[PDB]
What does this fold into?
Amino acid sequence: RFEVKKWNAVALWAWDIVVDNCAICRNHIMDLCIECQANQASATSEECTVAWGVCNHAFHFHCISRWLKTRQVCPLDNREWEFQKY
Amino acid sequence: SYHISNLLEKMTSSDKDFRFMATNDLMTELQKDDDSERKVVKMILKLLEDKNGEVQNLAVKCLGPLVSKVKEYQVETIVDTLCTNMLSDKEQLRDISSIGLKTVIGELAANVCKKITGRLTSAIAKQEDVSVQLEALDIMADMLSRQGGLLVNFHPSILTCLLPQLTSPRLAVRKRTIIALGHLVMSCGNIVFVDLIEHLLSELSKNDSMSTTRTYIQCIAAISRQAGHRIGEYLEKIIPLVVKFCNVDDDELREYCIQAFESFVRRCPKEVYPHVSTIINICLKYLTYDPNYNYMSWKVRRAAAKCLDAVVSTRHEMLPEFYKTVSPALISRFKEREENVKADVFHAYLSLLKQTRTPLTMLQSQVPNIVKALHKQMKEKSVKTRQCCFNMLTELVNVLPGALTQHIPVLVPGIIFSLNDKSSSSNLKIDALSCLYVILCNHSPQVFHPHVQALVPPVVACVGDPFYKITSEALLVTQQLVKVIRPLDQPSSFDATPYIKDLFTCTIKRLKAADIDQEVKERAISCMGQIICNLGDNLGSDLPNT
Amino acid sequence: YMKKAEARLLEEQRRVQVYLHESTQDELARKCEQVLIEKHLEIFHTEFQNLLDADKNEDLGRMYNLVSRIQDGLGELKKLLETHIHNQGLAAIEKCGEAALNDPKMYVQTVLDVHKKYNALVMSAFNNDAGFVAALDKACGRFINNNAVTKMAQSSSKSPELLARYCDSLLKKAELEDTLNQVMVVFKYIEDKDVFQKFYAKMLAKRLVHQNSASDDAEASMISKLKQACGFEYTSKLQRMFQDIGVSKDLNEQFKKHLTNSEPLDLDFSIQVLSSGSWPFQQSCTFALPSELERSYQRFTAFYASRHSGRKLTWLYQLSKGELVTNCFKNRYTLQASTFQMAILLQYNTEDAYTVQQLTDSTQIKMDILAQVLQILLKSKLLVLVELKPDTLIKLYLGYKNKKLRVNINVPMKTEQKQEQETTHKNIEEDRKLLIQAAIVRIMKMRKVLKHQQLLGEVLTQLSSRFKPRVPVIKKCIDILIEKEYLERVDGEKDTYSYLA
Ligand SMILES: [Zn+2]
Ligand SMILES: [Zn+2]
Ligand SMILES: [Zn+2]
It folds into this structure.
């Protein structure tokens, strides 16, 4: 017989706008990019990771990097984009 | 003209890269017109609210070189904008403005300081928000660090705003107020120092609360540390209050009092002589304060030991009194059960020995007590305690060459045990070897004769240690050992035959190595030369090869 | 001889001022100095080295006073002092040995002792001259960045990691300000500041999540010192953790207020809700939630979904702890354990034995983590059956006793620290590569056409304050950016790049 006197829990919150998938490319966030998976493997595919912003949105690094060449605005919210995690 | 205009145009490009590059180029330009200044100043000031941290950092960095190449009016408006942003509502604005203001103050004059002082006084005077108080106090301390002598006319106002802050519920405010008060005292007038001193004395005479007395004692200790000679005229009134407060049954209050006593002893020595006796008496009384143990209270013992060290290390014309009363207390208190307090006691006695360099007769008389106290400590499992004991012995032999003539049979086993121990460290072995070398070099060879059989194996083992410092120390010890075993300037009846082979074999391997450090090579050459000089008649066919 | 020479110089000054013409003063002083000091500089250098070996500050000060009269005579002394300080630092670090690689306090204390001793020597004897200060700084940087400890780890990044670990130990659960200031003085000489920043941030996150700090004022003071030393971006990134802590405590308070108007729960509940992008914690491993904690999880999930719309919660069960009270033992005990320990402990109450192959399926725990937590429990005198097999039988051991009612059976795993350090170092490497790429993109955006050496100089100048980049890394970054159509090589005029929009 064991009883739980108290519990201290830690949780992380993220946006539910997308269900565990990138927004620019509609694939799993933990998988490869569309360009990376369509093209042959190389040194570029090694650095394929997920990127977070101040607005707490998660995209593939390649996807957001390609998006930022022409526009300077986060795809989901119209605020300016700023990298904060890799 | 066109370059500056292009940079200003690019600083609003809605792209972070262009803004960063324009700011970097501008900063490079100012490190190597008139209407253009009114635009670049506004651009720099409004870049502190940017949406990118890198641009804000570049703007703060650019705030430095800017003020040294712009008219005084724009410097004044920059200062005013930063000061009024310091009391804003956004946390980022407050932080960035504080950083920028510190940058502007650090590199730099009388007009801008006068402008800043009023705003800082107004901010500190208010007690509604504590973050603004802390930032303003830090900025004021930074300002008083350098070019603080220009603010002669604002010193009474600075005192008036600083003094009530020593009662605020937050402790950080009190600490920053103490720091600011020390910086103010370092450069100020006579009247401000005076009325500050009597304000502190009046606040100490009454006991409004237990917490305030601690911070007042801390403040007077800080002022004593900072000014020094200027507070020597008021010790006659300062000391009785501290003596009275020492008797209060608060552990935290005693430590501050003893630290204040140490500060008075160290910083102002000329006008502290009359109270030296009572300071010493209080320290001796409180050095053994431990109500929960019989043979958080170690702080007062540490403070007492440090104060005794300070009073011993600074007064040279009182050695007879020291050897009369202080020394037996420390010798009896070598048995502390707390490591830090024991280290402080050992440091105090080491300082006494260094100051000893007649007191020699009394030190000789006290040597047996020191030996009896050290014998129990040398068998402990703590490396620091054994290191302290070995340093103590080394210093004692240094001051008296023949101090340990009758205590070798009880001192050698401790060195032997420390030499061959798996738990011993390299520093402990080096210290033990150095102590053995010093002992051997300052005593007659006859006393060590019954102990050669026990001393040779550990030294020979230390010669072959993988670490080269231990090998060098062992060779240095072996040279003196071979000098002692067969003296040439005196007649001896000792038989050195059995140990010659071991002493030669431990040395020849180091001698012909061709891969060892230079120090080991030189020590091996010297040791082999001494061995050939002192025992050349007993070596066989190895002499030609050597 | 130094005292004799000083007395003779004073006597000559007296002579020439009393009974000689004033035009002879400069010539007599120069001739006396040349005869007395300049001719014995070779002996003075050896004496200087000997006095450096055996600490004698007064003699060093007298020598500094004597040689300062000779034109360009202090350079050799500065070089000798720099070499001596470097050798002393290396020797002091080497004596620590194997223990210094895993004992941050010893390493930092040795460095601080050497620096303090020679800084005091420079102030007291050499009158705080600029050249001697520069020599001390160069020597300090040299033996801090490279030493015996760094050679063992085969990397120069071990020193910032040890400094960060020392700071964490100091700030865990009046003299603290002095040692923090000393650490900040040490931090100036470190060239790889990004490693220190990353490790300090991760350990501060660990302190804040588990609520184990000595005092908040110490943290505020350290943040202020970091602001003074580092930039504004790093402090801005650190402040988000404090903001999230405040938001989390407010949310916990308002949830406790809400729980009054409902059925009370069976346990005391505290929750730390953190932003996913402002904290270094990764996704938790798979874990089957035990039946006793379902009610609290469901209640808080419903509450969070009620207040916030587009937010979903991810639960990190490896950072969650609690207290277990037990009564089916020899006596009454309270147990402090993590969620995994509770899962592998509360899984059976009246049962006595289980098989690990079945326990892992029941609790949905991976192999290595389950093995580590089971061996932690085994070493804790709370479970009995060194090697673990899937068919091994494990049974609860009755009759266990403790010397105190309160027991903390939550001890860190051995492999966890090494894995964390390796992962942090790797992540620093990819971060450095990404920063180099971003900088190259920035300069190519500002300057449309640029050469190679100018680009390298600009990159090193811009990234200097954080780390010193290596040329092969920069070349690899340029090559990978070319493949991604960010910049292209112009036809002809070899070794020249142009930005491509
Ligand atoms: Zn994608
Ligand atoms: Zn990709
Ligand atoms: Zn967004």
Q: What stands out?
A: Chain C touches chain A through 56 residues (CB under 8 Å). The longest strand of chain C covers residues 268-275. Residues 491 and 497 of chain C are 10 Å apart (CA to CA). The pocket of zinc ion (ligand 3) is lined by residues A 53, 55, 57, 74, 76-77 (CB under 6 Å).
